[PDB]
Design an enzyme around this catalytic site. Structure first.
Site, PDB file in Angstrom:
ATOM      1  N   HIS E 201      38.251  -3.480  23.012  1.00 14.20           N
ATOM      2  CA  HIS E 201      38.356  -4.801  23.437  1.00 14.20           C
ATOM      3  C   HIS E 201      36.938  -5.679  23.599  1.00 14.20           C
ATOM      4  CE1 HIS E 201      42.411  -4.606  25.809  1.00 14.20           C
ATOM      5  NE2 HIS E 201      42.238  -4.352  24.489  1.00 14.20           N
ATOM      6  N   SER E 205      39.746  -7.010  17.767  1.00 16.20           N
ATOM      7  CA  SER E 205      40.431  -6.338  16.752  1.00 16.20           C
ATOM      8  C   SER E 205      40.320  -6.809  15.308  1.00 16.20           C
ATOM      9  CB  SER E 205      41.886  -6.251  17.229  1.00 16.20           C
ATOM     10  OG  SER E 205      42.807  -5.370  16.186  1.00 16.20           O
ATOM     11  N   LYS E 227      56.192  -8.316  19.115  1.00 21.59           N
ATOM     12  CA  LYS E 227      55.850  -7.663  17.868  1.00 21.59           C
ATOM     13  C   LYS E 227      56.013  -6.061  18.063  1.00 21.59           C
ATOM     14  CE  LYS E 227      53.209  -7.959  13.472  1.00 21.59           C
ATOM     15  NZ  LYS E 227      54.115  -8.486  12.929  1.00 21.59           N
ATOM     16  N   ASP E 228      55.197  -5.735  19.384  1.00 26.23           N
ATOM     17  CA  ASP E 228      55.056  -4.484  19.616  1.00 26.23           C
ATOM     18  C   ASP E 228      56.272  -3.712  20.063  1.00 26.23           C
ATOM     19  OD1 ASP E 228      52.518  -4.879  18.867  1.00 26.23           O
ATOM     20  OD2 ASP E 228      51.582  -4.470  20.782  1.00 26.23           O
ATOM     21  N   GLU E 271      52.446  23.954  11.836  1.00 24.86           N
ATOM     22  CA  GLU E 271      53.169  22.867  11.615  1.00 24.86           C
ATOM     23  C   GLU E 271      52.701  21.845  10.658  1.00 24.86           C
ATOM     24  OE1 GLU E 271      55.909  21.386  12.897  1.00 24.86           O
ATOM     25  OE2 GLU E 271      56.539  21.961  14.947  1.00 24.86           O
TER      26      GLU E 271
END
Ligand code: HEC
Ligand code: HEM
Ligand code: HEM
Ligand code: HEM
Ligand code: HEM
Lengths: 50, 51, 139, 101, 379, 79, 47, 238, 60, 68, 109, 54
Positions: E201, E205, E227-228, E271
């Site tokens: 922040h 971005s 959107k998220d 894994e």
């Protein structure tokens, strides 16, 4: 510095191997219970002992 | 590295080398002290009594 | 003829990389021949221009060969049917699309897909059925 | 020269800042030198850059490209920021040289 | 008067962070993975808190505890498999975000990028410790293999490995320590993520174009919140597909056998998220070299901001760098596949060449290609 | 620090917007959407695809080679 | 000046009810808002 | 060298398919009458078969058939009890070493998670049970070892465990080796994944709910983003 | 003439309290309806396998 | 009677298939080779693996239909 | 240039919170308990995390696990009793803290 | 809360989990506490504003 060293050492040793594991450090294997031509595998130190 | 290649920075390094070496010794003693490094501590006379 | 033997020797539907390399070599040879004929008949203004034309034709031919071999071998593998002509048809249409892309024209791409794919399928059928383009005189 | 120019033009078209209406200097990373160069730009050029960047951002928001007629040509792309950036970098280099000795 | 959202302290922080944050209007769907990562962290924390209410860390009762959760705890299987596959979704999103930062030059945000590297290391540690907890054959033997790598460290490897083990070999002490660490670490991850968002922040971005978007900033609340949410719903679709249709697709069957320290499983493989580092480790013959290479693989990200040589932040306008980046992605996939496969004639050479290519692409090819692009653009 | 009021200086940029309730959520979603998707895929494919094609070739070759390695060799038992 | 620019046509994006320029939008406001909020309510119910 | 098990068309392979509980009941018959002697299922209990393939009364009757050791009494001695639905399936051997001694040094694995544990799932078990064959030429089997091509190493301590008419099913289904193997594999699949059918039901419901929600949430996102998407920006310098 | 959607907006959607009342009542009835329908769908897909289908043969 | 298992019938059917037939022929050849050699270390496990792979792949498609 | 303590975001937060926070000069020792509460929280977290490394929560093994911590674990007794008495110290400090808030009218915040 | 009819293994495991998690929630609530206090400063033993003497 003395006090901090002692405290940090105490915690780090607390993470170190406990009394029971160190007691299990050494193993006694009874021979003559293993027949000839046979491999006997025992858990000593947490890993296979042949 | 291009900017820090000049006569002044070489002078600056010489000024701070004594301080850097002293701090390095402080780290060396602290590591040996904290870890009780027997290899180094055996040489020291009085601390040798520990072992 | 060694390049043709190289392409044939690799079993169909196997060693797709080697098959693609052989197809690319064949395409490059054909492009080089076409470039030589173009340079002779239609002269290039400069040596650099001749090199550019040779590179363009050779790369187009090599891309066509590589796409044909890669797509045909991959289709033969995935479908698992080695002798089917449809694999050759798919490879040929892919080659035609590559030619259209190199020529930057959709119509060339579509016409090439149709004709080249059909020709490749016919070639595969000739392989399977023993058709002879040039027949030894036997009477 | 012609061969180098041809490869440069191929790279220019391969990169898409022309497709979005942007010029090359519009795409530079805004480091401190570039920030000072932008600060020094004349008002007309700064406003033109701002609008070009905004239009490009709007186009990318909708995943669209400008009509091919409106693409920036390789010949007509003007390096507006390069002289100011060169002057800024020269000043920074002079300051660093003074600092060195 | 004042708006409580803008004047109350906690509401002020929340508003600045996610309601009135100036966000670029051209951020793509690759900018939805990070919020998906936070959702994954929260989901992991909740599912694990509910799992731990039924899980016991003693070697006698761990496997029986997991079986109790699966067969007797009400909806226990849902929680367990949600956790297992959520870890995989976690690492998928982590890799995708690393790729997004690499491709769009987001590593230029130095503080955020380095905090992210720390977060990646912490999450990998958490996943490795978690896998040991079920105490299946894979858990025990993978822990033995991975922890034994630390012995390579010169003059302190053995003592460090024994200290971590709590003893001579992996045993009840190691399991209990790993349960404690697995519990604590995610919250440290949450705090590090908070620092990550703070540093981000500070600078805003980055947008896909790589150009400053202060002109085209849009409010986050009426746009990126929805959107998220949509991205989270899609991720939930995928994760639930895994949980309810292929609950064991991404897990080795051998972990459903109780750990036998006297018999190794036929294949000891980590894994899937760890498989590329495993391939790199196996590539280098020397043990210490393998450990150092495995460390460098993740730590090479730290050097990414320095290696930058392009005059353009993003790869969107740099094609050759795009080709190199996709080569890198394919190489990472190849490394995962090789790490899964047994060490043999065909795979060994492929793994060695792939590791060489990974390091070469990151360190040498990419910067020289960026310089060539700079020359081509006349910059 | 970074707040909407003081982010940047812009002049003479007029923006016209329409209310969401006055405009269709999906305008020409397929008539325009599919051609745009095809255009983006055409642009990306040449850069993206080739490395994964290389991966597929390497994967097939490695699997086949391992299978061959396991297979018996007649010469070993000739004597 | 300010009188030399007219708002660009949005007709392609516009909804059917508000496409005509000679018809009051208040007539169709209820229908359009109802459709959008119906989508919202259904999403909320599923959630 | 290993032979990968063929993918048999199991009923439960379907994305939204359920185990045939009739096959589960016959598989439990097969386990309790054939496999239980050597293998064990520690993690399954008679209560687990109360709404799956047997009724509560049937499950309790089955449990009462097998005696179970009980907690020590006032005298301090253990005693044997008829058995209860809470009790887990009886363990065939007291300790693993005794099981190894009984079975030529090999420990019969627990069948509670066998289907999940082994690669190939039910296919591997089915092929191994129906895949016994005479030892191949040039292959010599040690004493007490039977050649099974699917089993890793091709030498298995287990003797061919299923043969025609090994058990008689209550349903009357012919007790062919294939039928017995199929029922037992279905039961083992239920044991490893007792939530199989419930998982499938939840999956169907989740697929339909996602099909509803994702388009609607997408519509909401489009509704909010239309203002930006339709935005027209005009640079009008002076 | 008001359309069905306009009537819905005016009656329920306009004031968020009635909007939430619509949401909650629809949630209750949609839970009932969807659970019933999807259970029927799955039972049909697996008719004759599910224990519920075959419980009668062995009970009583 | 003898309750002929569908496995027998289906494997007999699969043996009458080109891949099964060729695999069986290769198996027979390797059998003769291995039997002849006095002190050979070779085995026919791989040829058996091929034959059984083909046969049991066919049996996978055929068998379950019989088993009810 | 700028002072890193002021400029850097995390350093700025730490500085404002603890380093250069404006503080009344007369706040007495009763005000010290809040920092003592934070110290107790940190000590409890560390000690309980080191206990948790050796503590199993099964009813069969819990008491035996605490006895293992006390006897077998190296300095485990120190950790265990530090945790036990730290809880008491925490509550003592909490009560004194709330009493200070009540007596000096700190509840107006 | 018990996880059953009475206090038992489930209660003990739940309580271990909750006991582990809650102190961290306390560590976050403490930060919120300090933010709220910093908004208003610290009160003095006198109870009279101390902006003059800081
Ligand atoms: C003794 C009389 C047995 C009974 C009856 C059955 N099994 Fe068995 N089994 C037995 C032994 C001694 C072994 C060990 C062989 C080895 O070396 O692995 C086994 C093994 C199996 C396996 C293999 C699992 C694995 O280790 O991968 C399976 C899948 C299996 N047994 C299943 C099975 C079934 C289905 C039976 C009846 C329906 C059955 N077993 C009976 C001993 C005995
Ligand atoms: C638990 C793990 C992680 C979580 C929860 C997380 C979360 C987030 C979130 C929510 C964002 C903002 C949303 C977005 O930009 O998409 C973000 C941005 C970012 N993250 Fe992560 N992240 C994690 C791991 C990582 C890793 C492993 C890296 C790099 C190796 C990384 C690097 C970045 C970068 C560079 C950005 C800025 C992107 C931009 O500015 O466009 N993060 N992170
Ligand atoms: C990003 C965060 C986390 C990740 C990536 C993660 C990852 C994993 C993985 C991969 C497993 C193995 C699952 C399996 O083998 O079936 C696991 C198991 C487990 N983890 Fe986590 N975990 C996380 C957080 C947590 C938390 C917060 C808790 C507790 C509060 C927790 C407790 C457990 C438990 C109890 C198990 C055992 C489940 C089982 O045996 O099936 N985990 N974890
Ligand atoms: C933060 C404030 C905390 C308080 C007030 C608190 C309080 C207590 C108390 C009173 C006990 C029982 C003392 C006894 O043994 O008789 C206890 C035990 C325990 N606590 Fe803490 N605790 C705190 C934090 C934590 C944390 C963060 C952990 C993380 C693992 C933890 C782990 C444990 C464990 C494992 C035990 C049982 C071990 C034992 O009985 O010695 N505690 N706690
Ligand atoms: C773990 C729990 C707590 C922690 C860590 C904590 C911490 C602190 C700290 C560090 C301060 C700064 C002033 C000082 O040091 O005295 C403070 C102030 C204060 N706290 Fe908390 N506290 C806790 C619990 C509580 C409780 C239970 C109350 C009331 C029920 C409370 C009410 C207050 C008030 C009124 C002040 C104002 C002090 C002043 O006037 O300067 N706190 N707290």
């Amino acid at each position: 510095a003395y006090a901090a060293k002692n405290a940090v050492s105490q915690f780090v040793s607390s993470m170190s191997a406990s009394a029971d594991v160190l007691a299990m450090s050494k193993i006694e294997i009874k021979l003559s219970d293993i027949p000839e031509g046979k491999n006997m595998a025992f858990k000593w130190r947490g890993k296979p002992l042949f | 590295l291009s900017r820090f290649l000049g006569p002044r920075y070489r002078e600056l390094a010489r000024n701070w080398i004594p301080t850097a070496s002293m701090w390095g010794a402080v780290g060396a003693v602290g590591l040996v002290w904290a870890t009780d490094w027997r290899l180094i501590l055996d040489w020291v006379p009085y601390i040798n009594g520990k072992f | 003829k060694t390049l043709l033997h190289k392409y044939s020797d690799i079993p169909e539907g196997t060693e797709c990389h080697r098959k693609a390399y052989a197809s690319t070599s064949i395409g490059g040879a054909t492009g080089l021949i076409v470039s030589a004929y173009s340079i002779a008949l239609k002269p290039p203004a400069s040596f650099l221009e001749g090199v550019a034309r040779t590179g363009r034709y050779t790369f187009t031919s090599a891309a066509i060969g590589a796409i044909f071999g890669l797509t045909s071998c991959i289709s033969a593998q995935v479908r698992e049917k080695p002798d089917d002509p449809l694999n050759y048809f798919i490879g040929g249409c892919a080659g035609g699309l590559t030619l259209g892309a190199r020529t930057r024209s959709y119509g060339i791409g579509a016409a090439a897909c149709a004709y080249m794919g059909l020709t490749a399928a016919l070639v595969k059928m000739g392989q399977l059925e023993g058709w002879q383009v040039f027949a030894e005189p036997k009477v | 020269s012609k061969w180098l120019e041809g490869i440069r033009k191929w790279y220019y078209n391969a990169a898409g800042f022309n497709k979005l209406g942007l010029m090359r200097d519009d795409t530079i990373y805004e480091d401190d030198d570039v920030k000072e160069a932008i600060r020094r730009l004349p008002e007309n050029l700064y406003n033109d850059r701002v609008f070009r960047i905004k239009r490009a951002l709007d186009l990318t928001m909708r995943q669209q490209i400008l009509p091919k007629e409106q693409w920036t040509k390789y010949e007509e792309d003007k390096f507006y920021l390069e002289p100011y950036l060169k002057e800024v970098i020269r000043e920074r280099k002079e300051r660093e040289e003074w600092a060195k000795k | 008067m004042t708006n409580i959202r803008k004047s109350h302290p906690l509401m002020k922080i929340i508003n600045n962070a996610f309601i009135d944050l100036p966000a670029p209007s051209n951020i793509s769907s690759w900018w939805n993975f990070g919020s998906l990562l936070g959702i994954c962290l929260i989901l992991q924390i909740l599912t694990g808190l509910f799992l731990a209410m039924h899980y016991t860390s003693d070697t006698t009762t761990a496997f029986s505890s997991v079986t109790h959760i699966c067969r007797d705890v009400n909806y226990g299987w849902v929680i367990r498999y949600l956790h297992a596959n959520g870890a995989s979704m976690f690492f998928i999103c982590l890799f995708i975000h690393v790729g997004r930062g690499l491709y769009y030059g987001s590593y230029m945000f130095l503080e955020t990028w380095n905090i992210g590297v720390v977060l990646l290391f912490t999450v990998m540690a958490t996943a490795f410790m978690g896998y040991v907890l079920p105490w299946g054959q894979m858990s025990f033997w993978g822990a033995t293999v991975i922890t034994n790598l630390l012995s390579a460290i010169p003059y302190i490897g053995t003592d460090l490995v024994e200290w971590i083990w709590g003893g001579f070999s992996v045993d009840k002490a190691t399991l209990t320590r790993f349960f404690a660490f697995h519990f604590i670490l995610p919250f440290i991850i949450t705090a590090l993520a908070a620092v990550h968002l703070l540093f981000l922040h500070e600078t805003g971005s980055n947008n896909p174009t790589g150009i400053s978007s202060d002109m085209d900033k849009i409010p986050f609340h009426p746009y990126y919140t929805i959107k998220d949410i949509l991205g989270a719903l899609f991720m939930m679709l995928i994760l639930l597909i895994l949980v309810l249709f292929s609950p064991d697709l991404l897990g080795d069957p051998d972990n459903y056998t109780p750990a036998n320290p006297l018999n190794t499983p036929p294949h000891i493989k980590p894994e899937w998220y760890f498989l590329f580092a495993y391939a790199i480790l196996r590539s280098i013959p020397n043990k210490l070299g393998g450990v150092l290479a495995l460390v460098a693989s993740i730590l090479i990200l730290i050097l990414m901001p320095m290696l930058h040589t392009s005059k353009q932040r993003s790869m969107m306008f740099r094609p050759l760098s795009q080709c190199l980046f996709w080569m890198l992605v394919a190489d990472l996939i190849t490394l995962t596949w090789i790490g899964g496969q047994p060490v043999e004639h065909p795979f060994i050479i492929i793994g060695q060449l792939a590791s060489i290519l990974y390091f070469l692409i990151i360190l040498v090819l990419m910067p020289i290609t960026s310089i060539i692009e700079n020359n081509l653009l006349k910059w | 620090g970074r707040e909407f009021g003081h982010l940047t200086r812009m002049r003479h940029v007029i923006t016209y917007s329409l209310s969401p309730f006055e405009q269709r959520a999906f305008p020409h979603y397929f008539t325009k959407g599919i051609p745009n998707v095809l255009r983006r895929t055409r642009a990306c494919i040449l850069r993206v695809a080739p490395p994964f094609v290389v991966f597929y070739l390497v994967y097939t070759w490695g699997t086949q080679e391992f299978e061959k390695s396991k297979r018996k060799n007649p010469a070993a038992y000739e004597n | 000046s300010h009188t030399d620019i007219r708002v660009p046509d949005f007709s392609d994006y516009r909804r059917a009810e508000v496409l005509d320029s000679t018809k009051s939008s208040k007539e169709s406001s209820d229908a359009r808002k109802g459709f959008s909020y119906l989508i919202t309510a259904t999403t909320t119910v599923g959630v | 060298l290993e032979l990968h098990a063929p993918s048999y068309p199991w009923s439960h392979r379907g994305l939204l398919s359920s185990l045939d509980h009739t096959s589960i009941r016959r598989g439990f018959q097969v386990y309790k009458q054939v496999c239980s002697s050597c293998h064990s299922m520690d993690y399954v209990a008679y209560r687990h078969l109360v709404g799956v393939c047997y009724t509560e009364e049937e499950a309790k009757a089955l449990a009462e058939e097998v005696e179970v050791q009980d907690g020590p009494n006032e005298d301090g001695e253990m005693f044997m009890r008829p058995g209860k639905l809470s009790d887990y399936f009886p363990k065939p051997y007291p300790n693993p070493e005794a099981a190894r001694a009984a079975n030529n040094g090999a420990l019969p694995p627990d069948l509670s998670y066998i289907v999940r544990a082994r690669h190939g799932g039910e296919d591997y078990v089915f092929s191994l049970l129906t895949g016994y064959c005479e030892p191949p030429t040039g292959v010599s089997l040690r004493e007490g070892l039977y050649f099974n091509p699917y089993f890793p190493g091709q030498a298995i301590a287990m003797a061919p465990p299923i043969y025609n008419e090994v058990l008689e099913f209550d349903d009357g289904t012919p007790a062919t080796m294939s039928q017995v193997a199929k029922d037992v594999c279905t039961f083992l699949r239920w044991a490893s994944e007792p939530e199989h059918d419930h998982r499938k039901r939840m999956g169907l419901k989740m697929l339909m709910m996602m099909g509803l929600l994702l388009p609607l949430v997408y519509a909401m996102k489009r509704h909010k983003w239309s203002v930006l998407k339709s935005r027209k920006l005009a640079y009008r310098p002076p | 003439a008001p359309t069905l959607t306009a009537r819905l907006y005016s009656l329920l959607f306009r004031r968020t309290s009635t909007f939430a009342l619509t949401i909650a009542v629809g949630a209750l009835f949609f839970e009932r309806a969807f659970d019933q329908g999807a259970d029927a769908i799955y039972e049909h897909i697996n008719q004759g396998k599910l224990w519920k289908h075959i419980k009668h043969k062995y009970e009583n | 009677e003898e309750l002929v298992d569908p496995l027998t019938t289906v494997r007999e059917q699969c043996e009458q298939i080109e891949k099964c037939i060729k695999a069986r022929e290769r198996l027979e050849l390797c059998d003769q080779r291995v039997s002849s050699r006095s002190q050979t270390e070779e085995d026919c496990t791989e040829e058996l693996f091929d034959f059984l792979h083909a046969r049991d792949h066919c049996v996978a498609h055929k068998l379950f239909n019989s088993l009810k």
